RNA sequence: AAAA
């Protein structure tokens, strides 16, 4: 009987490819990549190592893509062959659907970034009916999360704490930002404090943190703070990416939510930290996190760390407490990140369904 | 008869203006979605009064097909050339098909290293123009109004580099810790260590005095004089001016400018560049450091080339001192080519390695 | 997956 073989082309995105294979489960698979697209094409050979073969063709010169795509028809016996034309060159799918369309039971099609598979062919379409694993879409990219956390990691009263270690920070952003960092720089000492008077305090008997907030009026604002793991919530902001990965995580689009992720190189050497990763099922959304922006060339580093492990597919989110300056939003603009800044769109209570909106307007955009 | 262009708009706005560059049309339709209606416009305002635009959904195949055999329709007697360089899979697809059901239709794209290909003939020529740096920037939306050249510098500013990095060569540390200290307050006179090491400004003189002890019970002691020295030792400018000195004497540059600065709309920085290279069918893009010490600096750099140059952009970063593995893995995640001078023959002798790799990769389409 |  004739088999099912599916051709596919290796551009830069391992995901599509992958997506493709996995779809439409072919009995053969031949990966056309090009020097520059190899690694990406042994990745996802790993992924399917009894049935995918490799071969290696000139991006751009049409002399040796039609010569070799030639030869490669003239090497397949009339089977059922599908190519998916996703990636690689507009050069590799300009004669790969052409020399293939001569065969009657050749079938071109293309995979979009919401995993709708567009028979170009037949002009039908259809809908994936699988959810990306995220350790997959990692490994395809050429890394491991070994390191990260769940929401479920983390005790209920850790989570109804937040509203109030973002009260106490609002009434003075400027003294609970230097408690905070110094608490954070030595954290193993149990009490930090600043000239104005104010404090931060561990009690390790009472399981407990007393603070004071000093305000420019010289008003004292001090209170307790107390949560299971509250000596990491205060950690360079862990109880504000706990917070976003709580509140996506009861999204009806989330389908997982990972929280301080560690990307690590060969040796063990870290190589990001991300702060919130989000499995949309069709794409995976990134978010980073931060009281507030003080290096807009942090928005740099996270977009390039989202292209870098899940690929141009992924959208990505930047939220801020603290209104964010001009110069960081366009920088925004120019990365293609979503701005959103929690004071502005509701405040810590009420900023869920400002969120949720945002999101959902770009959710199924495709990226140019 | 008309010549007229369809060309689609992608993500990347340099293919669609080299594609209307080489043919001259006298009629350019720029097909563009919503998420590609600012490149689209930035496009037109170079050819304002050729150029229209037209939007399309990216991927709906029977919103694609309708209009773009209507607009096909609506053209009887033209010359059609397609560009289908930018733009989804699926309208090079449609696109291709539809209008080459005309024996007056050209399907052509052309590559990051603007070689025209003519897919309908099969036939190829080099695109007969070279990259402005300007009108680049516009495209990708931005402005460059600030950068030096060379040539800002005098020649005892090129001649005394090797004199610097062979000091800094005495003891690097010692060395950063006195360069740290004047780039932070450079009106200050005196700078000085707990262990011996001081540089000095001498204000009658006009030089620096500097002294530089190692861990074995010596020092080593010179006089630092040049028209800009004060400007060469803040923050290591002295190594950017000798990467784009010895850039600007590559075959392959065609113009070298320095620490440039991209502003956004109130004239607040984005990015400081060090250095950027126009290579006629593509730019290079340099960042310089003595040491790498925050490795997600080359992320940072990588998303500004791209955000700037775009796609078919080089990027090089170059240190002093060796790039460790964990940045080296990093290079490779991002398509960065990183280069130490230290390991490839020192201050003196690095050109013709630092050339070898660069035309390896000159070449070659970015995934 | 929108100069791959
Ligand atoms: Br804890
Ligand atoms: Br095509």
Redesign the interface.
Same mark, same amino acid.
């Given at each position: 009987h004739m088999s099912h073989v599916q051709i596919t082309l290796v551009?830069?995105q391992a995901a599509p490819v992958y997506n493709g294979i996995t779809y439409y489960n072919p009995d053969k698979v031949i990966l056309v990549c090009?020097?520059?697209?190899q690694n990406?094409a042994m990745r996802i050979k790993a992924e399917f190592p009894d049935i995918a073969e490799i071969k290696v063709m000139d991006? &751009?010169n +049409?002399?040796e893509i &039609?010569s070799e795509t030639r030869a490669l028809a003239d090497s397949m016996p009339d089977d059922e062959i599908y190519v998916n034309?996703?990636g690689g060159?507009?050069?590799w799918?300009?004669?790969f659907?052409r020399i293939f369309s001569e065969r009657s039971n050749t079938k +071109?099609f293309?995979i979009?970034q919401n995993n709708?598979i567009?028979n170009?062919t037949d002009?039908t379409?259809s809908q994936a009916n699988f959810d990306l694993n995220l350790d997959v879409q990692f490994r395809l990219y050429?890394n491991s999360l070994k390191e990260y956390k769940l929401v479920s990691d983390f005790a209920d009263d850790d989570l109804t704490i937040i509203p109030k270690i973002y009260k106490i920070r609002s009434f003075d952003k400027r003294n609970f930002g230097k408690l905070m960092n110094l608490y954070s720089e030595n954290s193993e000492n149990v009490f930090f404090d600043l000239d104005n008077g104010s404090y931060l305090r561990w009690d390790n008997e009472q399981q407990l943190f007393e603070i004071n907030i000093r305000n420019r009026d010289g008003q004292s604002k001090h209170e307790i703070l107390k949560s299971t793991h509250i000596r990491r919530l205060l950690r360079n902001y862990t109880w504000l990416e706990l917070e976003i990965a709580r509140v996506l995580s009861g999204w009806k689009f989330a389908k997982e939510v990972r929280l301080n992720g560690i990307f690590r190189?060969?040796?063990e050497?870290?190589?990001?930290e991300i702060d919130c990763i989000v499995n949309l099922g069709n794409k995976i959304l990134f978010v980073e996190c931060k009281s507030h922006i003080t290096n +807009?060339?942090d928005i740099?580093?996270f977009?390039?760390?989202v292209k &870098?492990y899940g690929g141009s597919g992924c959208k990505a989110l930047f939220t801020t407490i603290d209104p964010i300056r001009?110069?960081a939003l366009?920088?925004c603009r120019?990365?293609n990140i979503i701005p959103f800044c929690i004071e502005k769109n509701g405040g810590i209570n009420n900023y869920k369904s400002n969120l949720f909106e945002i999101l959902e307007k770009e959710i199924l955009? +495709?990226?140019?």
């Open positions: 551009g830069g090009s020097k520059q697209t990406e991006p &751009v +049409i002399a &039609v034309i996703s060159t507009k050069s799918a300009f004669y659907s +071109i293309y979009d709708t567009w170009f002009q379409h050429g190189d060969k040796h050497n870290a190589k990001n +807009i060339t740099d580093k977009k390039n760390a &870098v001009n110069d366009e920088k120019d990365s955009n +495709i990226n140019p």
